[PDB]
């Protein structure tokens, strides 16, 4: 119907509309994460700071997808963001790991995207997908990695000291 | 129980939540408005940045709700973003028209937070709405009555001309 | 036989020549389009200027393919560049209209192409497409049925005042 | 039937649209000429460089013929743009003698339309051509002449040296 | 184990390791063949800072492959780096042909390491060795080819004239 | 035979190809032990920095000597650059102490390559020694023992606390 359509199968713009939606809810658990830290009886500046700049990221990565839909011919179809669903996640070494199965979450699917891109023979999107997405969730998921080692070696979450002096002088 | 509390209800609190899940709502109104006026079917690019800014601004507002929950030593409980709702909004006007009512929707719950606020003597939270929410409601429902007044008398939403010049001369 | 020459099949090096030939019939289409709306019975002077410009691109994808093959060792083969043969295309909007399915065109063979470089296992030629021609495709597309709704949604081709006012506010 | 159309004769229309093919053609054969000398076998890349402005200069001598067309009230007829035609042009010194006999071939159909030009009591066309045409085809044929005679006396097409220090000393 | 791992097979891993050796020992090959040339009795400054150049890129070859193991949560496991091991390199001509067959080694493991990231379907691997490696291989295998041609033309190795005159024109 | 060779002994010459080799030994170690800090679950990333730049050192080290192996007329022999040999590195105290004991084994070599140097009466290459690697020893030796010194009293390699504050407010 779509005018531009070309070479985009039904199930990849079905695809994308749930990608868009693991985007926004990822945007949604990295912002309720964040003003957790900016409780008073938190009060990690540093950790409430770098999960905003997360959130906002996510978001920028629905809008992406969401652009990619229209010019593509498909049509954007939109569900509810469900509230985030973690359950162990209150400390800064909790919300680091959660942070860590959560991007690994979302690369998982985008992977799987990919395989769907590729079973349709839409270049197209398998270029999309791994110049915009794949490496960025590398980087994400090694960055994580790396928080969490140190913030465990240095005796997270035990040790206040700790969290407070990684937020000072890595997340500073 | 949080060190900081003061003269801050209960039921305020409970207010302040429900206010933060209504005004990721308008955001996701925006949002989606936005990228329907992206499509290559309509395609008017004005009317797609205005109301993508308009969902910026709104994340923007529910933001500044979570961070005055934690100033008064409240909690933020989050709750699913619910999808845009709306039922005839597809055209310039017709979205013109539903971001009327959404931000009527939004100031009348301020204008309940507000009795609320001041049935519990909380003169700083009165002030907190008075002073960041109730005259950019008041702004924002003043400029889309204009935008709605204009492309109604320009022949919208029959006239494809009209929208098309409204999108470049008052939207551009 | 080149010294240069590793992984690149005889079937490539020849749908690259033929590339070649179709990004060069693109460039004189719309170069000839382009001087239809420089007469003196037409004159609006961005569609022409638009066109050129779309003229001048489809030159530098050619020249880039020339490189391609020199690149790879493949041996440059040229053929006679056809005139343009569109058959119902003199107004503002049947040029873009003319435009987008001369673009879905040249897609169509860039995709063509992948599929070949793929069954002949060459990632580099591969990367080569997606990375210099599918989303150009893919943007020059959208933008065209961007331009197609809009000439239409105003009145075009009756209309020759929203020819007039597109020419200004859009091409200009 | 054109509305400015004035002291123009149909046989000068028709003689600028073929004029219009042969500059065309003769920004192929310089395209062409170009990337022989990009090849891996060949490798002088000012050579390469010097050709492809020569094309570029053709095209735009295209351009401004079809931009008279339209000054003067005729209307272009494009034709296929032939493959170069040339049959002994593949080292320095025969591409350089190709391009001479090329701008004097071009040159001969430009005296022949100012021939007709003034037949017709045509003295705009007549200046135009004198203007734009004659005197840039004069120096382009002097300069070729310079090229080749340099070339044949440094010891070309033999003396593999003699092509390259040519194309580092005279053409970088 | 890692816990950054994830759709990164044991193979590739292991095939990464083997790449990282293969650009140390061509850093190296590259450093032998560079001093060559800054030897009393052979004396072509420019040929020596050129393949010096190059052995610097081919380490930033390898260390970009060590990033990426530890990126994907890989163990980097190092191997003897070999001396040199070409048997007919000792002219300008010579080591420039030792470059091409050195440069094309290379591009043939990269190849095979791109098929074997394809057929363990790990797309950022994939789209890593396209957007890194196999672009920068084509470039050098061409720019070697042209560098191996005009040595030949101008009359190398015989003609000491011709490669002092290389080294100061092309290599200058 | 080299006619610029003077006073320059015959073990001279061969024990600085064994100090090249060294030197190359060295860079290896460096660029082993630097992406160890790189892995995810070490990921102290200034003394991934810090061994990095001593790596490039070495490697410079490695080229003044063959720039003067070529200056005294001498003749280069290259060797295979062994795999780094360490047994008990992988914490950030015990790759400083190997650092230590890697720079104590160069500067020991270089010690005796100057007695053989005094021996065979060499003055410039005594003088080349001290000016550009002994002092260069003494401080790389000076400044590893403060490194071992605070990380040890800081209380590696059990503390991870220390090991972090180090990286950080010494390496950073
Ligand atoms: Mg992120
Ligand atoms: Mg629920
Ligand atoms: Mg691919
Ligand atoms: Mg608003
Ligand atoms: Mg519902
Ligand atoms: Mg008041
Ligand atoms: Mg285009
Ligand atoms: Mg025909
Ligand atoms: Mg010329
Ligand atoms: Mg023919
Ligand atoms: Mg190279
Ligand atoms: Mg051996
Ligand atoms: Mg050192
Ligand atoms: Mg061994
Ligand atoms: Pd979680
Ligand atoms: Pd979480
Ligand atoms: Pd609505
Ligand atoms: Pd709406
Ligand atoms: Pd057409
Ligand atoms: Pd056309
Ligand atoms: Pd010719
Ligand atoms: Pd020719
Ligand atoms: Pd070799
Ligand atoms: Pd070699
Ligand atoms: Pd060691
Ligand atoms: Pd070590």
Same mark, same amino acid.
């Given at each position: ?10 199930? =990849?713009? @079905? ?13 949604? /658990?990295?912002? =309720? ?7 008073? *009886?938190?009060? !990690?500046? +540093? ?13 920028? %990565? ?7 839909? +229209? ?8 569900? *509810? ?8 996640? $209150?400390?800064?070494? #909790?919300?680091? $790991?959660? @942070?860590?199965?959560?991007?690994? #979450?979302? #690369?998982?699917? !985008?992977?799987? !995207? %990919? ?5 349709? #023979? ?6 999309? &997908?791994?110049?915009?997405?794949? +490496?960025?969730? /590398?980087?994400? &998921? ?5 928080? /969490? ?13 700790? $969290? ?9």
């Amino acid at each position: 119907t779509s005018q531009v359509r070309q070479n985009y199968h039904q199930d =990849s713009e @079905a695809a994308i509309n749930r990608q868009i939606n693991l985007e926004l809810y990822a945007s949604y /658990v990295y912002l =309720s994460m964040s003003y957790y830290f900016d409780r008073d *009886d938190v009060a !990690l500046k +540093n950790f409430a700071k770098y999960f905003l700049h997360q959130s906002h990221e996510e978001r920028e %990565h629905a809008e992406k997808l969401m652009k990619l839909q +229209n010019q593509r011919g498909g049509r954007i179809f939109l569900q *509810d963001i469900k509230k985030p669903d973690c359950d162990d996640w $209150e400390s800064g070494l #909790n919300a680091m $790991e959660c @942070a860590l199965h959560l991007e690994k #979450n979302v #690369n998982q699917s !985008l992977l799987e !995207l %990919h395989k769907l891109a590729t079973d349709k #023979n839409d270049p197209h999107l398998c270029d999309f &997908i791994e110049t915009h997405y794949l +490496n960025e969730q /590398v980087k994400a &998921i090694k960055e994580l990695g790396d928080h /969490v080692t140190n913030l465990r070696k240095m005796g997270a979450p035990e040790s206040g000291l700790a $969290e407070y002096l990684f937020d000072k002088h890595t997340l500073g």
